[model samples]
Structures are given as structure tokens and as C-alpha cells.
Target: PCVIYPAIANQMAHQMHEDAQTEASKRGLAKLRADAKQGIYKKNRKSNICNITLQHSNDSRNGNNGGACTGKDGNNERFKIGTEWKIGEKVETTDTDAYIPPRRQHMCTSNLENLNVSWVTEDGKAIHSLLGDVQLAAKMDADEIIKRYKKHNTLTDPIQQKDQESICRAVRYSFADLGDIIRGRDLWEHGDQTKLQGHLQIIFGKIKEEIKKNDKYKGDEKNNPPYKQLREDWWEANRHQVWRAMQCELKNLKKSNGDCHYNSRGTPLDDYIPQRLRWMVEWAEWFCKMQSQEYDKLMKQCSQCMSKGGDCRKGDVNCTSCEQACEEYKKKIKKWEKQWNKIKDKYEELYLQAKIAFAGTSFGGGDRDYQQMVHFFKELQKVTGDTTLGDTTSPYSTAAGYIHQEGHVDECTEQTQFCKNREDDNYTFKDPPPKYANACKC
Candidate 1:
């Protein structure tokens, strides 16, 4: 009973000081209310932010300024500049961060026109909106990032979509950007990811994040747990696949932003596009490539645009192929391809010849081929070759005199596995010690 009584009392004691706490709160509240009513609150900022002044002894309104600021003993005979300052321009505060409370509507126009954007459109159109449903999808740039994050890397759930593999490829290349914009995977795995386990895990965590960002899942994760769960499980299964897609995507994305570099008229170098405003991705391959027939159609347009008297300069969208002046570049690559083919053929021929010289069989000719390779080696190396063929002769000579033996091939290649073992590593064998190998001596 005693213990129970104490516990009950302890519980009840939580509110015991309420009356005192109330007065403390009410006292501050009452004082604050009074301050508010008096407009003193408007003039002063919180605590120490006010009452600051530059303490200067050298400069003064009165000309008699340059002495130590000794107190009222000096106050006994100070100058009679009663300086009742006729205030002119009040100085704006610059000590701490100035609070020019962010404009609910900024007015500076790009061409320096007054843009009361709620009241007027960019043109002379009267938008007449005092408080309107402005779809400030991007209210501000920082806010715009959040807006994008709210939709970042959102894959249109291809749940029952037949094209999964090909679709995953599109997503693969986009994650770099997904990471690039949001610092998503600089923390995951930066630079070359030879090992990216932790990176993948973060990537999946982010994968879930993008889905939840979708309009379907609603604002709260609890709003659609099953939907969330479906994406999570699906991603876990498909997480590994993006690696290949990523490789291909990166390979494709860097594919030479080309131009008519050798424009016959020598075009000037130029550049464009607001960089930070990236293309949000899901079915992202390329605008020109993703929409089918675009490449063909675009090239046709370029060619037509560059047709007679169709000289569009750099900014003209028609110069998408940049004046189509890359004939010299094509010429060089064509020449290079020919050179490449020739060298390739030479390598293949040498490779085949060596293979044949060493090529042999298990029962008999294997030893012969092995000797041929040895002789070839010696001849090429400018050394005297093996002499076993000269030393001995036999068509089907009687068991070669030694006891019966399992089929043997002197060459490593003659055996099922490089002559089965040991001598498999025989190399330049003829160029050196093997003077008894069975083949034409050199």
C-alpha cells in the first residue's frame, strides 16, 4: 500500500508545479503582448541584434572630435554643436544578415521592368491575380530542386510491361545523372566503381525514394505500403541488371557530340542550353533516338536545310548536323579503317601459320609436327635445328626397338592436353637443347 501510494503520488506530482509554471508563462506572455501593442517589437529585433553602433572617436558631427572620450568631467565643456540632426537618408543595417524579408513577389524584370508577376504577366497581359493558384511548380530554384526530387528518377512502373530488360537499360544510364543532381551516389560510390556493393545498396535506397516521390504513393509512405513494397522487392531482384545497362548507357552517352568540324567555310566554335535544368529520366535514351524515325527525319531536315542557299548559322536549329561539313573527317576515318583492316589481316596470317606448324595428332604425326615447329623456330632464330629425323629412319619400323608403348606425341599439342603434362611448357625447344627432335633438320 505504501509503495503503491508513492507511485500514485509521483504520477500526480507531474502537474504539481502547473500554477507556478502558468504565472511564469503568463508573465512573459503578458509582457510580450504589451510590447506588441506598443509597436516596440516592430522597431527592435530579438535580443542583441539592436543597439549596435560604430564606436569612433576621430569622426564627429561637431568639428571638435579627436580626443579620448573622457566622461562628463570632459562633458563639463564639450562643443555646443546641439546637432539636432535633420535626418536625411537612413542607413541600412549591414552588420548581421539584413532581413529584407524575401519578397512574396519580386518585381525586377529582366529588362528592368516592374514585374508585379501576380498582377501582370511577362507581356502586357493583365493577370489580375492578387492571391491566385499559381502553379509555382518551381516557386524558386532551391524549391525547384525539391520539386524535381519529388519526381526524380521516377520510372513509370513497368510492372506488367513486357519490355523489362530493354527498359532497365534506359534506367541504367540515367543513374549517374540521378546521382549527379542529388549527390545521390557521390556518397554511394564516386569515380570508377570497381567494387560497388555499398553503392548499389544506397542506389536501391534511392530507388525506393524516387518511387515514393511519385504521385501514386501519396505524401506519406504509409499511404501506400504495398505499392512501396512492390517497388522494393522488384528493385532488389533487378538491382544487379543495371550494371550492364549502366556500362552500355555510359558508353552510348559519351558518343561524340559531333559537328561538321571541318566545315568548308570554317564555322566558328559555339555552345548553349541551360545546364542545371537536366532532363528528368525514366524512359530516357535520347530525345532524337527514343522517338523512332527521329534520326532519319532529323538528318533529312539537316540535309535539306544545308541545301543550296540554306546556310543556317550556329544558332539555327536547322544546323543540327552543323552545316554537314565533316567530309574531311569522313575521309580520315575511311583511310584509318583501311589501315586497320590490313594490320588485322597480317596478324591473323602470322597467327594461323604458327598454329599449323605446331598442329598435330595423337597417334603419329604429332611428333612430326612438333619437330616442324622446332625447326621453324631454329630457322627463324638463325640457329642450327634438330637432327632426329636425319639420325633415325622408319616407315613402320619394328616397334622402334624399345618395349611396347602407349601412343606418344613428342609435341605438347599432340597430347589431348598439351601432350598430357610435363613437356607441355616446351618452348623454343629446338632453338636450344633438343637436337634429337624428329623432323627435317635445318
Candidate 2:
């Protein structure tokens, strides 16, 4: 009575059973390889298609010898599943899709520089690297890795800046150990927690925007467990406080130039950046003013003597009278150049690491869009060009260019041109080269 007749089902039903076998078989190695190339495997990086430790309650079929079956046979069956190689049952034959949440990465006690070595670079390059290992179809996961990334990012990047904060933060995490907070056989949710944190911002200010934790959600879920619903409670703490505090900060933000100035250091976001980078950040404004004054004062001094002899205005000669003027201009801008050099070197180092980190990144991770970071560097170059000379391109800058007088050279280029031309052997520059020859000897 093994049911020799085998009660076969109808055509469609049997076909469906056949189809499930084929469909599941369709995900073979060749298909897996193809999916890997197409990046389809990323979602399954840390997903394990493992054995299912069957739930005793779900097995009405397993009450056989009852307590008598508690021997080796029972032990063997206890950890097994009834999901006979089906189409959908995948992890533990599908143990509810167990998940691992993200947690703080351990910083190596000795030499932190190599903490997550080869895993995450400072610029980004997250998923495809060590943690996920996109290089050879190996990898790393879901739900687990969000909270810590968000928390770390808050301090790393306030005011919600994109690139360095996010990309870099993700990179740092990729190397650290994501804890084993096992969400056994269950699909979990993990993502941005910004709005949930509106209450957190209130400690900075008592304004409406800060205190009023308004509703904000993306990608919703339903019929969630009571605990998951408690996440909604995060809003209860400050819906009003977040708004009122926001209101307060917003009003005062006006005079403070949008800087809440709320750091333990008594410095605002606005203050810290400028103060820390004044050499590069404040150089131009100060230089503009300094250049203006130097130009006027030097020209007047040089010309005072010009009132007696050769036109110091005519820069054809590096007039000794203008020597003092030249020294003054040289002294200041050179100092400016030194400051610029230090900033430029550090900035370029940033560029180099970012270039590598975001290269494929698999590229910039969550904190930064490598492309955007690239654009930033490009724009930085533009700023550098605008603020300081390229190489040794300046001696007096605009100040000397302003030395227009009755018998003076119009600009530095012209003076150099006058100095370099032979004005002899009938040798003359047709449309003088773009620059002077640097020597003023005929």
C-alpha cells in the first residue's frame, strides 16, 4: 500500500510540478556565472542557500513514533526540512531568509591604518571590494549593515554632505566586522534613519525644525511586528520638539549665516571648516585686499622718483626705483604661494586616494558618488588657478599690471617683451610670442 496507483494529478498541475523543477534548475553554474558578470549576484553576496533547521510545529508529518522516535532517527529528522527541493525554498531550503545586521567594525588595536586592509578604502569602493569581493564572485549582505553606517556618518558628515562623508564612511565599515545579530530565516529591513533622528538634532537647538520630528518614510512595509512598529515610536519623542527647535535654529541661522554654531568647541560647521582651512579658504579674500594696497603704495613710491628721471612706468627696464615695489609684491604673494602649496599637496593626496577608491568602487559606495568627487577635484583646480599663480607665473600680479603711467609699460608681459627683444640685427618678433623671453638684453 505504497499507493501503487500513485494518484496522479491533472495535466496543468503535473505541468506545474515539472515547471518548478526546470525553473530551479535554470539557476545553474553557467547562469550563475552570467549573472555574476551582470552584477545580478550582488544581492546574493552573503546569502547562503543552506539547510533548514525545521520548526517542529510546522511538521505535522513528523509525529511518527512520538517520544519513541526520539532516538538517532529523531535526531536526524529534527534538524531537517520538509521542503523537498522545491522552486522557492532556498536558504535552509529557505529558513525564512536569515539576515545579519550591520554593526561597528572592529578597529585593530595595533596599526589602525591597515584595519580593514584591502576591504574598504577611505574614499568609498565598498560592495565590490573585500566585504563583497566582486573581484571573483565572492561576497558579503542585507538589513544588518545600515544603522552603524548612518550613525558614523552623522558625526563624519553633518549638514548632510554627500561624497567624502558617505563614500568614505561606507569604505571604513566594509573593513570592520559586521556583528552576528542573526535574524534567523526572516527577511529584514534596513536603510536610512535620518528622519527617525529628528529628535537627535534638537539637542543642538530648541527650534521647530530641530524639535519637530515629522513623518518621513521611503519604501514602506506593512503588518510589521510590534517591535518593528516601535520604530514609529522614534517619532513620538520629538514631533513637536523637532519642529520647534528647527524653528528656533532656523530663525537664528540668519545672522549666523546658517551656522548653528553648535559644537562643543564653540564652533559651528561654518566656523570649523574655515578656521581649519583658512590658508586655502581665506587666502583669496585677504590676498585681493593686500594686493590692492601693495599695488597703489608701491606704484606711488616708484613714481615719486619717476617725477625726476626715466619713466619707471616704462617697465622696459627693471627700474631700480621700482625695485622696492617689486620686493614688497614678491614678499607677500610668495608667502601666499607657500600657503597654497601646502594646501595643494594635501588636496592632491586626497585626489589620488579617491581616484583609486572609486575606480570601480564597484565605485564611491554610499558616502560619495566618485563622479561627483571627481567633479569636485576638477573644480578645485579651477579655484586654484583662479586664486594663485600656476608654477612661478607671478611676481607682482595685478598690482604691477596697474602701474600705468605716461612712460610706463602697460603690463608685466610687455615689460618682459621689451627686455627680451633684440631691437637689433633687424631681428624682431613678428607677433611676439605669447610670452616674453625672460631676458631683457638686446
Candidate 3:
């Protein structure tokens, strides 16, 4: 009984282990099948099945034969049989003295223990430990590594290479102390003077470099070529260098000032100063270029007029014109001025109406105003002797005084023909009928 009991207990233990493994495999395979059906494993046509036997031993000795099992009928089986053991059979169990099954006892004990108490794996490390440190190091070194790699591959002049290196170094150095300054500012309640000073120095250094570059070109006209051909080329060569230097200086200034909202004297600064100055410079340059072009055009026109033996500025009345031509030009200017004044007055009156019609204190109300303004403009066009009324030319008369008499006659004839066709519909008026003499009662 003792030997039989030992054999039975061993068999039970082996059977329970096999059953558990089979259940786990079944669950895993079911999940894989579901995932495959849902197209999760479709990406890699092969290796989609969760078959554990393929990963384990392939021996035929212990009921496993080359990653497969043989059932009673010699069929290759993937699942275990539950009916192999009979109920109420005289099977010996290990420690049958207590009349409790060993398998059930073991399972019960396992169930009583909580599996989630220890979060760490058997290797004594949390799951995050595997990837957390690697990610942190990557985050810290990614930018620097990328910049270095790019610099290594990119071709550049020695001067540009040096400038890039300097700029990067300065930025790294400035930001290195940023965290410390922030901590001090928050904990000790002190201003970040160290960071500010570092930033200012960076800006000033950049500005100094720019100033040097600018001054170097002052007496280098011998090296400069024709302005027309070299303008774009020169800008391309130097613009980036100038822009980088300016950006470095601005960044430094902003950092050193702590707020970037105050002037050198610690007074509050106007936010629009930099932008306004940039716009003003651009506008002045454009204006100067335009004036120069206009002046050249005027000179050419004057020269052509003189060559033709005409008053050089007769219609405009310049000093180059003869006295008689000048007087004639002045009278013409006077006439034009009077005409322009009258037009201007009319325009002002119409414009005021348009402005009022289109004015709105809020939102979509402007659409209604706009529609009214359009109508007003159409009306104004009609009254100003403009041929276009309601966006159509008036078929009245041309500026050459050619009246559309033929069209008028045709229209009158057509109307007469229409009245004749509906003669019975026309009413006759008889005088001295009654107090309502002209009225015809229907």
C-alpha cells in the first residue's frame, strides 16, 4: 500500500502539472488564434501561433515525440485526455492517512497566497529598471550627439565651422547652469544673477563678433565687385553669419536680464522698439530705391523731350519749359485742379455714405452694411455721369454726343405694336364725366 501510494502520488503530481501546463497552453493558443483572426499577427505571416512545444524539448521518451504527442489511437494529439483515469478506482495516494488529495491541497494553498504582493521579478529588479535608465541617458545625450554627427558630415568653411562650434558651446554652457539657477531662485528666493551675467556675456560677445565683421568690410572696396552682380552673392555669403551673431547676442541679453522686459538702465522697455526699428529700416531702404528709380526715369523723359525740340516739361511746367508753354501748362493745371477739387468733394460725400453704411460695432452685422454700401456705390456711379449703372452701361448717349435715336425709335415702335395687339385691354378716357373723371371702375 505504501509503495502503491507513493506511485499514485507521483502520478497525480505529474498529471496535475501536465493539466496545468495544458490549460495554460490552451489559453495562450486561444489568444493567439483570436489575435490572428483580428489581423494582429497578419503582419508577419509566419511565427503567429503561440506554440510552446516548438520552443521546448522534442523527445519521444516522455510522451512527447518531436514536439508532438501520440494518443491511444496513434493519432498526433495537441490536447490531453481527461477520461484516462476512472472515478472510485483503488489508486494509492501519497500521505493518504489524512484522506485529503495532495493535488487539491497544493492548489488550495497556492490559491490562499496572493501573487501580486511582490512586484519585483525573480531577478530582484522592477520592470521599469530595464528601460528607465537607458531612456534617461538617451534623452540627455541625443541633441549633442546629433549635432556632433551633423557637423562631422556637413562641409563648411573654416570660419563658419568655428562660429557654429562656438555658438553650440555657448548655448550648452548657458543651459548647464539653468537648472541650478532655477533651484536657487525657487528655494532660496534669490534672483538668478549668475545665469543672467553668463547670458549677457554671451550676447555681448556675439555682438562684438558682428561689429568686427561689419567694420572689416568698411575699407575692403577693392575686394568688392559690381553692386548689381554681387548684391545677392554678398548677402548669401554674409547674411547667415550676421543673423547667427545677432541671435546669439539677443539670446544672451534675454538670459542675463532675467525678464527680457527691461532696458540697460533697468527701466521698463517698449515691446515694439525692435520690431518697429526693423520695419523702419526696411521701409527707408525701399523708399530710397524707389526715389532713385523715379529720378532716373524723369531725367530720361526730359532728355527725350528736349531732343524732340518740345518744351521739356510743358504739360508739367518745369524750369526747362519756355515761358509760353509754362503759362499754358499752368492754366491746364488750374483747370485740372478745379476739376479734381469738384471730384474730390463728390467722392468725399459718397465715401462718407459708404463708410456709414459699412460701419459695424460687432460681428456679422458688417455683411448687411457691406450690401448697403454696394448699393450706395451703384447709385453714386449713376449720378456721377458714369455709363455703368447697376453694373450695366446706360443706352442713352456717348461722350461724343451720339444719341441712340435708332434704338429709341425701335423701342417706341415695339411699344405701339404691343398696344395694338392688346387694344381691348387699353382704357379710353372721356372728359366731363364725373368728379372722378379719369377713373374707370372695374
Candidate 4:
């Protein structure tokens, strides 16, 4: 009894089913492409999509097996209902207005909402989650790589496994490439271009170890897998310490004439602690004091000569006049006093100018605190004179060193000024050029 449906109705149902299958395939393909671009993919349990392994059944429904069945004699019967049919189920026609149960509808809607929320939050938390477990090991690797390079002075070659083992034994430091670890990829693939082969090896090892550990721990179907979580906690606790150690090692390496400090062309140390300050306050202070004393002594001699009636004026007095001549001495005293005052004023001007130049524009701004200026002057004295200001050496010898070394004082002052000017030109900020001031007539 062959029960046949209306031909027109059967044709219409076949067309609708074909259209629905085509639509579903198109949608699936679109989703696959989108996910692949993002480096993410739906993990289909039945087939590995990334590797292109198709998991198709032998049933002749899709073209992978064969086309849809057609009713014929032996071949038709096999196609229509064969051993493959045992594993297949008939597709029931669903009404366009079928009532989907509330529970199923709710579950489907909630799942969609959860997926959307997860996607949104994924970007924000990716760095934290990906890097949390591997930072320590990576940092340790970076440090060890730097240390070995320093000791061997060979950054081009691979670090031997024994060397890594030794380092691990000595410091108990896990090695890795932090950037690669964070990205959940091989360090060699993601490490910075500046990294050496030795460092790369360490990073690669760390990554491999982490992956191995992840695999081992993730195999358990328990409530809490300690491998991933514990690794993350360990990394968080030790990352900074390892980074700091690496930095210290790098510094030492550079000092040992390694190429690690290749890009370290920066402002000089003397610029921050002005070079001029060294000469001005250190050597020049003593120089000025000696000059002051000399002028004072000459004044005293002139006063005595004038009181004893010697010639007071330069012209009136003989160069070899006696100090007992009171009138001449008194005249000489006034002349010496005038010359001494001019000399004093000159010294004061130089000192004040140097102080202002070195101390900068902020002199006497608050409470007249010249501590910085004074301290700088003292430092200068130490550098140039090779003696501190407060040392209780013979005042005469100190005074002589100051007076005799006048040329050095001038040179130091000039150098200080040059340094100050250079600092001002390079470091200090300037206002923008006046816009309308340079305008020309149209």
C-alpha cells in the first residue's frame, strides 16, 4: 500500500525545507568567518573546524555522502531506508505559529543575553586574566637572560639548558617571556624584537612549562583546579620583585660595558647639579676673601702712614714713604679706603651675579633663604680648591691659596656661567612667539 500525498503539496514542502537548510548554512558560514577574524572560534565537539576535519555521517542527506533519496527498486530501497536510517530521525513539520514553551524560550533568551554580556566584558578583562598567572615567571626569565648576557658578554648565542637550570637552582626564579605569556602564545612568536636569543629561549621555556602545567591541572574535573589559579597568584606576588631585579641586573650590565644601555643618550648628570656651582662657591669664595683681606691691610698701612705725617695722596707720597708721617699717612688712608671700597664692591658684584645665575630667578623669594646658593658655593670650593670651607687650616695658607689662584677663580666662574646658560637654553620652557608682532602688510 503505497500512500502518496498531493504532488503540489509535496513539492512545496521540499522547496521550503531546501530553502531553510540553505539559510542555516549561510548563517553558520558567516559566524565562522567572523570568529576566525577575531582569533576566536566556537569549539564544535563533533568536528575540529580550525583544522578542517569534517565530521559527516554516511547518511545520504547532505552532498558529502550523496544527494537525497529517490524511490526506485533495490538501490532506491537502500537509499530510502538502509542501515544508515537507524541513526537518522525524520524531520517533523513545525507550524509557523507553534507555541514554544515559556521555560525553553526563557532559557534561550537568557543564554543569548549572557553571551552578549560576556563578549562586552571580554576586552576589558583580557589583559588581567591572561597575564595574571604568568607575569612572575616571565619577569624572572627576563632577569636571568639579562644576568647571563652580562656574565658571558654574549647576547647573540642561545643560553644552554644547564645555564637556565643553574639560574633556577641558585635563585629559584621561573623564566618566561611576559608579553608572550600574557597573550597565551609562544614567546618566540610574540617577544619584542630587541630581545636576544638567550632571553627568547628562557621565555620559550617558561611558556612551555606554563602550558604543560595548565594541561596537567585542567585535566581534572574537580570544583577547583589549583594549577591555573595558583600560578596566577604566584605571578602576581613576584612580578614586581623580578622586574626590579632585572632592572638592577641591566644597570650592572651597562656599567660593565654591555650593549644593553644602547639607547641611553640623555641629559648629563652635571646639568641637574649645575657645574658652575662647583667653581663659584668652592674656589671663588676663598679667592674673594683673600682679596678683601689684602685691601684691608693696605688701608691699615695707609692710615698709619698718614697719621705719622707721611704723604696721604699717591702723588704726594714717595713709594717708599715711612708710616710715621701722620699727615701723609692720613691722606694715604683716605685714598686706600676709597680704592678698598671699589674692590669690595667689585667682589660683592661678582659673588652676587654668580649666586643669582646658579641659584636661578627664585633667589630671595621666600624668607630670604639662600641655603641652596650657599651650599652650592661650598660644593664648588671643595671641587676646585680640594679643601672644605670650614676646615681649620692655617688661615694664612688658605688665604694665600685663594689670592694666588685668581686665574683659576676667573676660569671657574666663566665655566659656571657657560653651564648655566646651556641649561637655560636647553631645559627651560619658552613662551610661544608673538603672533601679530611678526605680521607683514598684505
Candidate 5:
């Protein structure tokens, strides 16, 4: 038995559903048209609502068998989408919501003198005219296409004249094959990659042929060009320039490294170095002195006429006078680097000693001692930045690592042997303990 609901209730529900669907479709069409005018296209996975494709070709939705709607079904479905259509032309849309993809455009003017016959001119109106009659335009060879265009319009004639301009523009723009114009950027950005790639090669070849004739292109094709060919060629030509530029950067960095001062400001902690650690302070002072030596040596070399004139390579205008200094620093720093590696153990040992001394004192070793440690760490790391010394493997680094680990107070506790009774102490609590010797232990 067929179970039936009330006819009035069923009718009302069906109408409501249909009305909502219609409203949604109307809104969708409005948005689609708005976007299409600005050369935007939207896709619907299930339905071919606009009956348009990205190629500006007519498209249709498939019915039951999961294919395009055909026969009476197809005709009726298309009827609602509107009739009169235009492609890159002035034919008005029968429906305001109808989609029409705009013509391919470019940065255009009538400067067509040096360009080839196979290149497209950047005039939408002219392209529209030639494209309007694809059948007639496609009939002639490229040579005849140019000839007929020149015959119809004088060179002095305004670009608004379309009949002859269309033929010439089509042939010049290299759209003769597809009988259509596509922008170079658009070809790269949109469409099937493999198919568009073939088109780009032909277009690029045409451009190269024209560009080769110019005075500016001095047989540099092998070294410079691009996508993959483009990028590879450009680097192949320009890599030397870039390499030279980076050498200048290297010179800059090396100078900065040599110029770096261990004590850019007053070293208040230098006076506090106990006689036991005097050797550590002396080594650091010697290290800074060697750095200053390198800087002075470089400054002496740069002071000569070498500073005024650049070494001539591709051009004398592009000279690297400091190139010598970079090389000199390279040699000198290698020697300095060897010395720094040997001292890294002593360096870490120095920090461990300072750390222990600071930790033994009360109140975090006072501001002077605390800041001294901070300054020492900063200078030590600065050395790393300049000479990459901190990266060297050393035994004292591991020992120093142990010094900062948990339950290591026993290390400093042994040093209390020096902390004798106040009377027996050779050094009395004199002068409120040297303010400069902020890291002194009790």
C-alpha cells in the first residue's frame, strides 16, 4: 500500500524547498558574474552552472550516466543559463549573471618596430577584430597575414583602426597557431603545464631572435636565461658578480672581526685578577693585542694607493681593493685560530676559576664581580663569533661543564682552606674588602 501524506502539506513543503534552491542559485550566479568580469573563474564540482570553461569554450554538465547532458535534457538545462554569448567581444550578455571571460591583456602601446611578425601586439580591440573572424584569419600563412594588414592601414593611422591592425597583431603576437592570443605571464601562471610549456618555448625563441639583434645583448645567451633554463642561465652569467659581492661582504666581516676590541669600555675587573690567575688575564690581554696587530697591519695595507684604485677585472670601476686584506686576514687568522684553539682550555679554565670565586662570595659576588663575569662570557662568545674558537674540542670545557653541575659545592668548599681565622689571616678585613675585588671569597 502507498502511504500518502496530506496533498496540501506536501505541496507547501515542495514549494519552500524550490524557493530556497532558486534563491541560492541566484546569489551564486551574481557572485560568479562579478568575479568573471575581473577575469576570475569559479568551479562547481557537481554542476556546470555557468556552462563555461577556462579556455573560453562552451561547457556542459553531464546527466545520469555521469556525462554531459544531451538531447532534450541538455537543451532545456542550457536554456535557463541565457542565450546570446560573447568571447572577448562587445556582445552583451543576455542574462546579467552570464559569464564572459575578458580578453588576455598586456602592457601595450604601438611600439611594434623592433618586434617580430610572430609576436602579439598588446591591443585588445585589434585582437578582437582578428579573432572575430578566426576562419578568415587562419586561412593565410604568417607572411601574407602581415602583407594584407600593411595594405589596409597606413603606419601613421591611429591604432583605433582595427581591420588591418588585427591581422598584423595576430601574426606579430605568435597567436597564429592557436588563432588566439595568450599573455606570456598568463601562460606561465594558468593552463595545463605541459601544453603551455611548448607554447612558451616558441614564444621565448621569438623573443630571443628579436633580442639578439639589439646592441645590449653581447653573446651572453649561454650564461643568462630562465623558469629552470631562466634561473640557471641567469646564475651562470651573474654568479661571478654575486660571488664578487659576497667577497666584499667577507672583507667587511673580516675587518669587523679584526677591529673587535675585548675591552671596548673600561675593564674594572682587570685590576681584580688575583696573582694566582694573573697568567689568565695576561693571555687574554695578549690575544686582544694580536687582534689589534692584525687590524693595524690591514689598515697599513689599505692606506696605500690600493685604497684609491680597484683591481681591474671585468671593469676597473668594479674593483676590490680590500680583496688583498681579505686574503691577508685569512692567512693571519689561520695562525691566530691555531693559537686560540690551544688557549680555549685555558679560557674555559679562567671562566671556571672566576665562576668559583664569584660563587664563593656572598650577595652574588656584588655588581662588579657579577658584571665582570658577564663581560667575560660576552667577550668569550664574541671570540667565538669572530674566530669560531668556542667550537674547538677541549678537556677544560668538559671540566668547566662539571663545575656548573649539581652538588658541586664541594669544589669551592676545598678553597675555604685559604679562608683562615680573622687574626691569622695575612690579609685583614682591610678597607671593606676591595670594591674592585668584588669576587673575593671569605
Candidate 6:
């Protein structure tokens, strides 16, 4: 009750103080308003709100200068010469009657004349108007439509060539994205085959419209092929190109599950893994087997000596040979420990070398193949007692995760295309592909 009374009294005192402060502030504000109206304090006063206009022209007498002294001509009025003050030049009196904002003037008259001319030629009509002729034929599937458009790669005009390649490149990307979506395991996994076909048809029709819009016939007479035929040829070439690209993407995706080079070019990282390191593992296994066999033999001999009332001491006559055998076992096992360390250390060095040698190519801020190599090596380490190997710190940050992140899977998809096209047989697995040439041995 006492605590409550004190709190209530304190709260009332706080309210009284607040009320006094509020009343004092109101009275002070009243005095300040009266003083302001009488202009008692002028130096620290804020100016009244005024309309602001955007000053475009830098001309004098426009009255937008911060101060007369701050003008570029400086404070001297004698140096400020006015252009309108000159005699014998009749300036228009109506110009000062009302303010008219200046309009930008272009120097060339030919550009204005060209703007009035019809930009489109008679042959190059609007693509929308030509859409009436584009009706799907009977029994025309997506493949048939794609097959129909697969006929035009080489063009005579450089501009037409650039335009065709640009359009096809976009189509190739769209096709890859669609394939990725369809093949995806979880994220964006599309189900309907009919929808895929519809997409292809839409893309095909879009290609037809774009080819017509570009009008390849306007500049080149030699390549006067119809829009449909030209579209066919372009689509055909890219179809094969995109197929091989997808195949490479799939192959690399599988390789990523295990040991593969961590470059932008996904190649086999350690091709000679079985022949080289497997033998080392085999040797380590054999060493462990022999050491165990020797230890058991010596321990058995020592136990029999002890059981037969022998002291099991080397110098004593009762168990001299047993003690010597025990000593020999200790020495051999110690040697094996050193040998094991040597083997493990050498293996780690080789792993690091392989990691560093193939560190060149990375996409999307990471290397997929590099990660696979690290995974494979860690798995291999688990097989041979999982010894702490090498300096764990590496220049590369594997924590950045796989290369497929950050919209770069598409780039690697295209890289797969470049790699396949590099070989004579168009096979990515062939040795000496230049990218896999640096794959570390042992």
C-alpha cells in the first residue's frame, strides 16, 4: 500500500510537471508569434514558404543568382555587359509580354526530313498483317514444325547473318531453359508433354514472325528465300546444336556426382585413380596386415614364456628370446607408424596438387567439378582410416557452393556445347581435349 501510494504521488507530480511545461511552452509560443509579427528578432528567423521554379537559362537579370557577388562575372557591375542594351538592334517587344520556355533546337534539317519519310519498305510490311497467312497445316506436330524450319544457316548479308544468329541464340537459350525445367527433379519440374509441344509451337511461330520482321530480302537478292524456309534452316542447325549441348549437360551432371575436373570444362579429374592411388591403398592394407601378424606372433611367444615360470626379461636366461621378440615387435610397429604417416602425407600432397592444377575454370562464382573432387577425396580418406591430411586451408573457398547457382548453369550448358564441338568425333570424353590435359597424375 505504501509502495502504491508513493508511485501514485510520483505519477501525479510527473503529470503536474508535464502540465506546467505544456502551459509554459504555449505562453512562450504566443510571445514568439507576437515578437515575430513585430519583427523583433530578424537574423535567426526562417523565411516564409515561397514557390520554387526550375531555372533553366543561366542568363543575367533572370533573378535566380544566389547573390550578385557570387555570379561568374563577379561583383563589379561595370564588367556586366547586357546584350539587349546594344543600340541599332531591334529586339522583339512581344518576347517580354509573357514568359515562354525555350524549346531544344536540332542543328541538322535532314534528320527532320528523314523523320517524315516512311521507314518501312513495301516488301517489309508489318509482321501482324502477315500473321493471317500463318495457319498450321494438317497433322503438323511440334517436331514437324521444327523440321520444317531447319533449312537456313549461311547468309550473304552480314546484317542478316547477325540478325539470324542473334534470333537463333535466343531460341537456343529458350529451348535449353525449357529442357532444364522439364528434366528438373524438384524445382520448376514441368509435367505435361502437350504443354511442351505447345511451347515449341509458340516459339516456332514467334521465330517466323521475327524472321519476317527482320526482312532478309530487303538488302540481299541472293538470299531471297521465303521467311518460312529461312526460319526452317536456322531452326534445324540449332536443334542439333542444342541436342548435343543437353547430352553434354547430362553427362557432366552425372560426373558431378563423383570425381570430375573442377574447370568450366567438366572433364575427368583423376583418370588414373585406380592404377596409381588404389595401389598405394593396397600397399597400406598389406602393411597393416603384416604388422598385425608380427604383433600377434610375438605376444603369443611372450605369454608362453611367462606361463612356463619364465621372467619374460631379455637378459635373464628363462625368457631371453621372448623378450628379444617383444623388443623387435615394438621397433617394427614404430617403423610402420612412421611409414603410414609418410604414405598418408604423400597422398594428401597429391590431392592438393590435383586441386591446385585444375583450379583455372570456374563459373557462377564456383567450380562444380572441384567440389566433386573434394567429395571423392573425402570418401577415399574414409576408406584408409581418415587421417588428417594436408593444410586444410585452401585458396579456393568451397563454401561458395556449386557452380550451377547464380544463373550460370545456362553458361555451363553452352560451355558443354563448345567442348563437344572442339573434338573431331564430337566426343567430350576423349583424351587430350586441352581442358583435361592438366588433370593431375597420382
**Candidate achieving the largest TM-score:** 2
TM-score of each: 0.14, 0.23, 0.14, 0.15, 0.17, 0.21
Per-residue lDDT of 325-410 in model 3, one digit per residue for the tens? Answer: 32342343244234323323433343344424423532232221233233434343345444332322322112101112111112
Candidate 5 deviant stretches above 4 angstroms? 1-276, 300-322, 349-442
**Worst lDDT 10-window in candidate 3:** 1-10
lDDT of 1 by residue, 1-442 (tens): 0000111211222232233235434322221111111111111222121111112111112332211121112222111111111111224432111111011011111111111222222221211110010111001111222222223324344322222332232232233222221221111121222122223333323333433422322332342222233232332222222222223222222222222121122211110000111111110112112222222333454553434465555556555443332332234324423432342343233323433343352223222123332333223222222223332221111111110111112212211221112243232111211211211111
RMSD of each: 36.3, 29.3, 44.0, 38.5, 36.2, 38.2
**Worst ten in a row by lDDT for model 1:** 129-138
User: Model 6 segments beyond 4 Å from truth?
Assistant: 1-273, 304-315, 353-442
Note the Cα lDDT for every prediction shown: 0.23, 0.26, 0.25, 0.27, 0.27, 0.27
How do the residues 311-333 of candidate 5 rate in per-residue lDDT, one tens digit apiece? 33422322244345545545654
lDDT of 2 by residue, 309-404 (tens): 545444544455456465655676465445434444544444544434533453432321233334343333333342232332221111111111
Candidate 3 segments exceeding 4 Å error: 1-272, 306-442
Superposed Cα deviation of residue 273, candidate 5 (Å): 3.7
Task: Please list the residue runs of candidate 1 whose C-alpha ends up more than 4 Å from where it truly belongs after superposition.
Answer: 1-323, 351-442
Count of clashes in candidate 4: 26
Better of 3 and 4 by lDDT: 4
Give the Cα-based TM-score of candidate 2 against the true structure.
0.23
